[PDB]
Amino acid sequence: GETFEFQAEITQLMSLIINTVYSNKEIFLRELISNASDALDKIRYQALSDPKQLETEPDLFIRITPKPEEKVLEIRDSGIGMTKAELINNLGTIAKSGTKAFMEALSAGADVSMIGQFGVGFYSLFLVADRVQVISKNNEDEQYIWESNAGGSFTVTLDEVNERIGRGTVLRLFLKDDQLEYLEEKRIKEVIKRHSEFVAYPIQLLVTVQELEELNKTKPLWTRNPSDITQEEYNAFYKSISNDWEDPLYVKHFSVEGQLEFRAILFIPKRAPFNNIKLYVRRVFITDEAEDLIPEWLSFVKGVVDSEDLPLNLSREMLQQNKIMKVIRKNIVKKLIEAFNEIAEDSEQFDKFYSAFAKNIKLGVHEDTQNRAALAKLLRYNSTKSVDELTSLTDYVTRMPEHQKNIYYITGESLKAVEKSPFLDALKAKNFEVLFLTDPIDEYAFTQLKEFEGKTLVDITKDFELEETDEEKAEREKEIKEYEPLTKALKDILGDQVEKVVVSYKLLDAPAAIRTGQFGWSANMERIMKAQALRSKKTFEISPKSPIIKELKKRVDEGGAQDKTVKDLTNLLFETALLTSGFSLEEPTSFASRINRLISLGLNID
Amino acid sequence: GETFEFQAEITQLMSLIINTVYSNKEIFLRELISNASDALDKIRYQALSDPKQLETEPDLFIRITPKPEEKVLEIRDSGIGMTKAELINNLGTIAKSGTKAFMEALSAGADVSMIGQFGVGFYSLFLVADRVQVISKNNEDEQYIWESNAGGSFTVTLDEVNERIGRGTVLRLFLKDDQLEYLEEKRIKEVIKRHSEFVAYPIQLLVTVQELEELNKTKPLWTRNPSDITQEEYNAFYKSISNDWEDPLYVKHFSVEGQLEFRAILFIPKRAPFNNIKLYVRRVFITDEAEDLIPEWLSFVKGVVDSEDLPLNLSREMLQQNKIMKVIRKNIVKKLIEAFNEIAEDSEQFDKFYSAFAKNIKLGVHEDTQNRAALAKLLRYNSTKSVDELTSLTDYVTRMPEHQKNIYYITGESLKAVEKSPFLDALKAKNFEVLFLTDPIDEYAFTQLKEFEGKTLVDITKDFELEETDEEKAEREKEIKEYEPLTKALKDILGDQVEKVVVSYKLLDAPAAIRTGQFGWSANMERIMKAQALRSKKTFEISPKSPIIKELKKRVDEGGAQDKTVKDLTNLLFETALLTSGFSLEEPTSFASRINRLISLGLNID
Amino acid sequence: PQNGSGNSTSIYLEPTFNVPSSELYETFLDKQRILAWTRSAQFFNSGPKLETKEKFELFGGNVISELVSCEKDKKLVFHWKLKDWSAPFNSTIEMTFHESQEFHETKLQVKWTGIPVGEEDRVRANFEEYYVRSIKLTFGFGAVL
Amino acid sequence: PQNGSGNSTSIYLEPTFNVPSSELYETFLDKQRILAWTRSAQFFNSGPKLETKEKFELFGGNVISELVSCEKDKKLVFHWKLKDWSAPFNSTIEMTFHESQEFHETKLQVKWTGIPVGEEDRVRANFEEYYVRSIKLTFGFGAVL
Ligand SMILES: Nc1ncnc2c1ncn2[C@@H]1O[C@H](COP(=O)(O)OP(=O)(O)NP(=O)(O)O)[C@@H](O)[C@H]1O
Ligand SMILES: Nc1ncnc2c1ncn2[C@@H]1O[C@H](COP(=O)(O)OP(=O)(O)NP(=O)(O)O)[C@@H](O)[C@H]1O
Ligand SMILES: [K+]
Ligand SMILES: [K+]
Ligand SMILES: [Mg+2]
Ligand SMILES: [Mg+2]
C-alpha cells in the first residue's frame, strides 16, 4: 500500500512542549544555564586544538542581567556561539539537539560531558517570557538576532543595533506581565542555588553602583579524587548542599565503575533532627525526592550522587522507573556499612556518632534483614562489667566464660532503674555479664536480631532458666514442695493479677518480683506501647531466702492463708515489686493509702 | 528580515515521546483504553441525531484478546472508527488530536466530555511493542490497516485478510520479547484496576475454553445524583477504590460548582489505617500522590476526587503547579468538618466514629489552626460527672456554675489512675467538673487550643489558684506560717529534688502531692517524651489537716528537723507522691527497700 | 464469546508471632478471642470454640470463613471467601505452625490458594493488617513497628 | 562591573514557648544553660553570664554572635554572623519578649535584619531546629511531637 512518513503539528506541538511538560516554571533558568554550560564546553574543546579560538573572548563565564525597568532578563554567555545556519537548524527545529550531534562527532575518549541531549529545552523559556530576542555571535560568522514569540514562525535578522560582542550568545527575554518575579535578586539566587549550583563555569549576576556576584563559588568535589581533597573542602561542600551550620562528622567519598558508573559523596552530620540525598546528572541537579534510593532508617546521612547513564525524564525533573535504582541503593548501603566500620575503628569519633544516631543504627537491625549482623557489631551499651564505657556485642562474647551459652540483657525506663534491678544479683553471682538497655527502641532491635555469633539473646526480665548442678536441683525441688502451700495461697489472694506464683532462686536479696511469660510484650515493652502518641502474661515469683517470705511461710502454717491482716501486706508487696520490675501500677491511690496506713503506724496514730 | 517557521525532527521527536516520557511502561493500556473510550463517545454523540450509525454494530464495548501463541495483545473496540484520511492525519501526525477537534465542533450545550486532548497518547503503545497493526473500520469508508514500526514512516494498506468488523478499531500489538508480562491475565487486570477501572463503557477481557469477563463492573458514582444513590451502592464503590474489607462508616458526596468545578466522594472507614485520596480527570485515574490535596492529620479519609479543568502534563501522571490545589484542599476540609458535624448529630454513629479516629481528631487540634475551634466541638472525654458516657466541650460549659471561669482537666496514663487522683477532691468540693485525659495525644491538643468559648483550659496537675473568700484566706495565711518551719525542714531533706514545699489547701484526702509548676511540661508529658521510640521541675505540696502531716509538725517542734527517723518517712512520702501525681521513681530498688523495712517491723522481724 | 469469570491463583505468607503454637492455635478458634482482633464477628453456633464445617462471618459479614480441617496446634484449614466475590469463586487457607523453641516464637506458614487473580494483592495487603497486625496489637504477640 | 556581593534582607519569627519571659531571658545568657541546647559553645569572657559587647562562637565556631543590647527580661539584641558569610555581611537579630499571662506562655517576636538574600531561607529553617526546637526539647519549654 501507500507509505507515509510521520509528521508533526507545529502550532500544537509548541504548546505541549512548553505548557504540558514541566511542573514548575522556574526551571527555565536551569536549562538556559545548561545550554550556556554546553556552549562553553564546545569552545573549550576547540581551544585544546587551537588556542586562537579564545582571542576574541578570553574569559569563560555566564552572566545574568535583570532589568526591572525594562522587563528584560538577559542571560549572556561566552560559549562557542551559533552561526547563521545553527540559528535555523539547531535552534529553529524542535527535538533537534546540536549538542547531541557534537558529542557524537568528537573523537572517542573525550573528557567533555555535555548536558543537552534532547533538543527541546530551549523552548522552556517561553513559560515566563512572551517574546525572546536571542543574540548570537560566532568566530566564523557575523552577529545575528534570533527573535521569536513562541508563535508559528521565528525571525533571524542581522544585528546592526546592539553592541558588538566578541563571542557567545545573548538571550534577551521579555518576561510576561505575571512572571516579573524572576527580575528580583533573591529569586534568581534561589533558582541557581537549587538547580545550577555546581556548574563548572562561574555564573555571574548583576546586582545593584553595579557589581557582579558569582553564584557558584563552591565547586563540585565529585569531579576530583578523594586523595587531593582536604577536610575543610568537605566542610564547605556540606554546608552548601545542606543548610546545616555544623561541619560533617564523617565523609564517605567513593566511586563505582564497570557496568554502572556513578560517584557519591555521602556525609554524616553531627546531630539528628530527632530527601537528603540529591541526584546530579551532567553536573545538573535532577531531583531529591527519590525515597527508594536510600532506606528510611539510613535517611539521616546527606550528600549527593553523581551519575551519567540515568534515563532522565523529558522534563529532567525526575527519572524513569528502572532497575538501576536498587543497584545504586545496594552500593550506598554497602559503602555506609563500611563507613560506619571506619568510624568504629576510632574511639573518640565513634562516641559522637553513636550518641547522635543511636536510633538509626538500631532501626536498621529492626527493619533491614541483610545487614542486620553487620549493624549488630556497631551497637554499644552498658553492662555490669562496663559501667562507664560503652561495650559492644563483640567484646561481650570475649568476656563470656566457657559455660555461658547465652547473651543476657535487661530493658527499663532509665539507667539508674536497671543498674540496681533485682534481676542482676543472680547473674552477678554467676559472673554472667548483663547488658543494659535504656532506650525505648532497644527491645525493638533485640526482638528481630535474636542471635549474635550463635549466642541467643535472653532477656532476664522474662522467664528463663539457668543451668545448675544436679545436687543443687534436688535440694531446690524439695524446697518448692515445702513452699507449695504458700505459693498456692498467694494465688487465691492475687487472683487473676498474675498467671501463677512459683518459687524463684534467681532472687537473692529482693523478697519478690514479677516476671513475664517468655512470650509477648515484656514489662518495658507494654509501657512503650501504651505511651505512643500516634499508635501480656506476668508471673509472680518469690525468694525463699528472704525474711519477709520466710515469715509468710509460718503464717499459712498457723491457719492464716486467708487471714485479713496478711492480705494488707502480700498485696502491698506484690504492687511494690511491680514497680521494681517496671510494670504499670493500676490504681496508685489504693497503693498510697496502704502506705499511708503504715506511716500512721510508724507515727503511733490510728 | 528572514522569517522561518518552526520545524520538528521526526526521527528525534518520535524518541522523545516514547523513551523519555511515560516513565512507567504499563500506562500504554491506560491510553489505548482511553482512546477507545473517546471513539465510543463520538459514535454515541452521532446516535442522538442518526440512530442508523449503530446499525453496523449495536454493542459498545472494549475487548482485549491476548494471544500468547503469537505474542500479540489485541485491543478491539466498537467506536466511531477512522477512515483512510483519518489514519494519516489524526493517527500519523504527532501532536495531532482528532478528538480535540471534535470537542471544538460540538453544539451549544453538549454533555459529552472526551479524554484525548494532546495527540500523543496513541504512540505510547511502542513502549512494549515493536510494531503495531491498527485495523480501523468506519461507516463512511472501507476497512484499512495502519501498520508502523516506530521508525520514520507508516504503511496504510487495504484490509484483505483480517476479520470484516462492522465498526470500530482493532489494534494488533506485537509485544516485545522483554515486555511479554502483559500477555498474562493477572498483569492485564492489574493495569485496568489501577488506571481504567471506572471507564463508562464495558471493558471485556478474553480469559482462557474462551470466555469473556467484564473488568469495569463497578461504575463510578460521581456522575450520578448523590440524592439518588443508595447506601449499598456506596459500600460497593468503597470496596473498589480501596482494598478494605469493611463497609464505609460515613459517606460525604458533594460537588463544588464555583470557579473550579469538581466532584468528590469522600469515605470514612471503620478502622484507622495506622495516598488514600485518588484524583480522576474525565473518568481516568491520574495519580494518588497529591501532597497538598489533603492535610496530614486527615489522611485517614478515603475516596476520590473527579475534576475536569486540571493542568495535566504530557504523561498525564501528575498535575502542574498552577496554585489551584489549595482551593480543593479548602473545600475538602470544609465539607469534612461539616461531615463530622452530621455524625455528631447521631448518638450511636458518633460513638463508632470517635472510638476509631480519636487520635486523628485530636491531632488536627495540634497542627491545624484555621479549623482548630471547629475540631474542639468533636472532642469527647470522661469526667467526674460523666464517668459512664462521654461528654463534649460544649456540654461541659453548660454544666459550669456561674462562678467558674476555667475548664479543669487532668492527664494520666490510664483512666483508673485519674478517676481517684487526689487532685479531684479540690474541685469536687467546689462542684467543678474535671475532664479526664487518658491518651498521650490529649495534652498536645489542649496545649494548642488553650481556650474554649472564652473559658481558659487549666490543668489541675499544674499549679493554679482556686477562688476563696476573705474569711478563709485569713485562715489559710494564718496557718501557712505555722507550717513554715516544717516546709523548710522538708526542703533540706529532699534537697534539689523539689524547688519548694508549699502548704496547699487543694489536697483533702491525701497527705501530700507533687505538682510540676505553672509552666512547661506536666507530670504526664515528660513521661511520654521519655517513652517515645524516636525521643523535670517539681513542687512539693502537703495537706495541713491530714493526720500524717500534723503528726510531722510536732516532730520538728521537738528538734527533729534533722532526725534520722523523719528522713526515712519524708523520702517515703515524697516518692509515694510521685506515683500518685504521675511521675517515675529515680530508682525503684531504694523505694522497695524502705517498704520492706516497714513490712519487717510490721511482722516484728528483728 | 460466552460471559464468565477468570481463573484463580495462589499466594504464600509467613508471618512470625512471639507466641507458642498452643496459644496461637486457640486464637483462631476462641470466639471470645476472635472478636478481639476482628472487632466484628457473626457466629451461627452456640459452641464456645469453632468446630469442623462451621461457618462464621467476619468484618460486618463481608468475610465468610469455614473451618474444614484442623490438627492439634499444627494445622488449620479454612474456606475463605469474600462477599464481593462471585458464586464459583472460593479460596482455601492452609495454616502450618513452625514454632521454634530456640527463639520462643512461631512462624505461621500460610499457603493461601483459590483466590482470584485480580484479588491476590487485595487479600494479601489486608491480611498483614486484619490478621497479622491485628493479633500482634490486641494480644501483643510481638512488637509492631 | 567589578566583582562584589549582594544586598541584604530581613525576616520575622514569633515562636511560642511555654516558659516565663524571665526564665527564657536567662536561657540565652547563662553560659551553662546555652551549652545545653547548643551542644557547642566557646565563650571568651570570664563572667559566668553573657555581657554586652561580648563575642562567642557557636556550633564548632561557624556561628559567631555578640550581645550588643538587652533589657531586663524584655529585649535581646545580638549580632548574628556565619563563618561562610562574607566580611561586610553582619546580621542583627532582635528578640522581643511578650509574656501571655492568661495562657501561661511567651511569644518571642524575632526581628532579624542584615541577612543576605541568598542565605535567608537557610537561617530561617535552621532557627526552628537549632534555636526553637533545641530549647523546647532540652528544658521542656514546649510540646514537640
Ligand atoms: N546559549 C547557547 N549558546 C550556543 N548554542 C546554544 C545555546 N543554547 C542553545 N544552543 C544550541 O541550540 C541547540 C538546541 O538546544 P536545546 O533546544 O536547548 O536542547 P538541547 O540543549 O540541545 N538538549 P536538552 O538540553 O536535553 O533539551 C543546542 O544543541 C545548541 O547547539
Ligand atoms: N481506538 C481509536 N478509535 C478511533 N479513533 C481513534 C482511536 N485511537 C485514536 N483515535 C483517533 O486518533 C487521534 C489521535 O489520538 P491520540 O494520538 O491517542 O491522542 P489523543 O487521544 O487524541 N489526545 P491524548 O489522549 O491526550 O494523547 C484521536 O484524536 C482520534 O481521533
Ligand atoms: K532545538
Ligand atoms: K496523533
Ligand atoms: Mg537545552
Ligand atoms: Mg490518546
Q: Which residues pair with C17 in a beta bridge?
A: C106
B213 and B169 within one domain: yes
Which phi and psi angles does D69 have, rounded to 5°?
A: -160, 145
| Torsional sign, CA A500, A504, A510, A515 | negative
Tally of structural domains, chain B: 3
Grid coordinates of B230? 443508595
Chains A and C form CB pairs within 8 A to the count of 33
CA–CA distance, D34 with B562 (Å, rounded to integer): 37
Among residues A197, A217, A237, the one where a domain terminates is: A217
Interface residues from chain A to C (CB-CB < 8 Å):
366, 443-444, 447, 450-451, 456, 518-521, 525-526, 529, 535-536
Q: Which of B444, B450, B520 sits opposite D140 (nearest CB)?
A: B520
Query: Across the beta sheet with B62-67, what order do the strands follow?
Result: A2-5, B153-158, B143-148, B129-137, B168-175, B72-77, B62-67, B203-207, B211-214, C2-3
Distance spanning both ends of chain B, measured CA to CA: 117
CA–CA distance, A39 with B544 (Å, rounded to integer): 88
B195 and B235 within one domain: no
Q: Which residue has the cell 530493658?
A: A411
Nearest CA of chain B to the CA of D26: how many Å?
15
A363 and A453 within one domain: no
| Contact between A61 and A55 (Cβ < 8 Å) | no
Pairing of strands B539-542, B512-515: antiparallel
Residues 6+ positions from A104 with CB-CB distance below 8 Å: none
| Contact between A520 and A557 (Cβ < 8 Å) | no
Q: Which of C102, C103, C140 sits opposite A520 (nearest CB)?
A: C140
Grid coordinates of C123? 487479600
What is the whole-number distance in angstroms between the Cα of residue A283 and the centre of ligand 1?
A: 16
> Do D125 and A208 count as a contact with CB atoms less than 8 A apart?
no
A426 and A307 within one domain: no
B233 and B185 within one domain: no
> Do B4 and A154 count as a contact with CB atoms less than 8 A apart?
yes
| Contact between B320 and B313 (Cβ < 8 Å) | yes
Among residues B370, B398, B425, the one where a domain terminates is: B370
B379 and B339 within one domain: no
The reply to whether C135 touches chain A by the CB within 8 Å rule is no
Contacts 24+ apart (CB under 8 A), D62-71: D62/A239, D62/A245, D62/A246, D62/A247, D63/A245, D67/D29, D68/D92, D70/D29
A6 and A130 within one domain: yes
| Contact between A64 and A81 (Cβ < 8 Å) | no
Range of the domain at A328: 218-370
List of chain A residues whose C-beta atoms are within 8 Å of the C-beta of residue B181: none
Residues 6+ positions from C126 with CB-CB distance below 8 Å: B243, B244, B245
Q: Which residue has the cell 487526689?
A: B422
Among residues A217, A243, A276, the one where a domain terminates is: A217
Q: What is the 3-state secondary structure (H, E, C) of A432-488?
A: CCEEEECCCCHHHHHHHHCEECCEEEEECCCCCCCCCCHHHHHHHHHHHCCCHHHHH
A234 and A120 within one domain: no
**The ligand 1 atom nearest the CA atom of A134:** 1
| Contact between C98 and C84 (Cβ < 8 Å) | no
Environment class of residue B137 by beta-carbon count within 10 Å: exposed (0-12), middle (13-18) or buried (19+)?
buried
Q: Which of B206, B213, B245 sits opposite C62 (nearest CB)?
A: B245
Q: Which residues pair with A63 in a beta bridge?
A: A76, A204
Experimental method: cryo-EM
Pairing of strands A451-452, A455-459: antiparallel
B429 and B575 within one domain: yes
CA–CA distance, A270 with A353 (Å, rounded to integer): 7
B254: left (phi over 0), alpha (psi -120 to 50) or beta: beta
Which of A14, A37, A38, A285 for a ligand 1 pocket mutation test, highest count of atoms within 8 Å of Cβ? A38
Ligand 2 near B39 CB (within 6 A): yes
CA–CA distance, C136 with C132 (Å, rounded to integer): 6
List of chain C residues whose C-beta atoms are within 8 Å of the C-beta of residue B246: 40, 59-60, 62
- Residue C130 carries which DSSP code? H
Q: Whose alpha carbon is nearest atom 21 of ligand 2?
A: B116
Nearest CA of chain C to the CA of A383: how many Å?
22
| Contact between D143 and B521 (Cβ < 8 Å) | yes
List of chain B residues whose C-beta atoms are within 8 Å of the C-beta of residue A320: 23-24
CA distances from A332 to A234, A259, A267, A295, B338 (A): 18, 16, 12, 10, 48
| Torsional sign, CA A413, A419, A421, A423 | positive
Ligand 2 near B333 CB (within 6 A): no
Query: Closest-CA residue in chain B for C7?
Result: B207
Q: Where is D76: in which H helix or E strand?
A: strand D75-78
B134 and B283 within one domain: no
Ligand 2 near B443 CB (within 6 A): no
Letter string b/e over residues B34-56, b meaning 16 or more CB atoms within 10 A of that residue's CB: bbbbbbbbbbbbeeeeeeebbeb
The full DSSP string for B223-240 is SS-GGG--HHHHHHHHHH
Q: Which amino acid is at A169?
A: T
What is the whole-number distance in angstroms between the Cα of residue A430 and the centre of ligand 2?
A: 81
Q: Which amino acid is at B399?
A: R
CA–CA distance, D48 with C90 (Å, rounded to integer): 78
A358 and A227 within one domain: yes
What is the whole-number distance in angstroms between the Cα of residue B32 and the centre of ligand 6?
A: 7
Ligand 2 near B116 CB (within 6 A): yes
Q: Whose alpha carbon is nearest atom 7 of ligand 1?
A: A35
Nearest CA of chain D to the CA of A246: how many Å?
6
CA–CA distance, A82 with A134 (Å, rounded to integer): 10
What resolution does the deposited structure have, in angstroms?
A: 2.7
Grid coordinates of A356? 547522635
CA distances from A513 to A462, A521, A566, A579, D127 (A): 11, 17, 18, 9, 48
Q: What is the 3-state secondary structure (H, E, C) of D88-109?
A: CCCCEEEEEEEEECCCCEEEEE
CA–CA distance, A26 with A124 (Å, rounded to integer): 10
- Return the SS3 of A111: coil
A223 and A157 within one domain: no
| Contact between B581 and B526 (Cβ < 8 Å) | no
Ion ligand 5: residues, CB within 5 A, are A 31, 35, 116, 121
| Torsional sign, CA A129, A131, A137, A141 | positive
Environment class of residue B558 by beta-carbon count within 10 Å: exposed (0-12), middle (13-18) or buried (19+)?
exposed
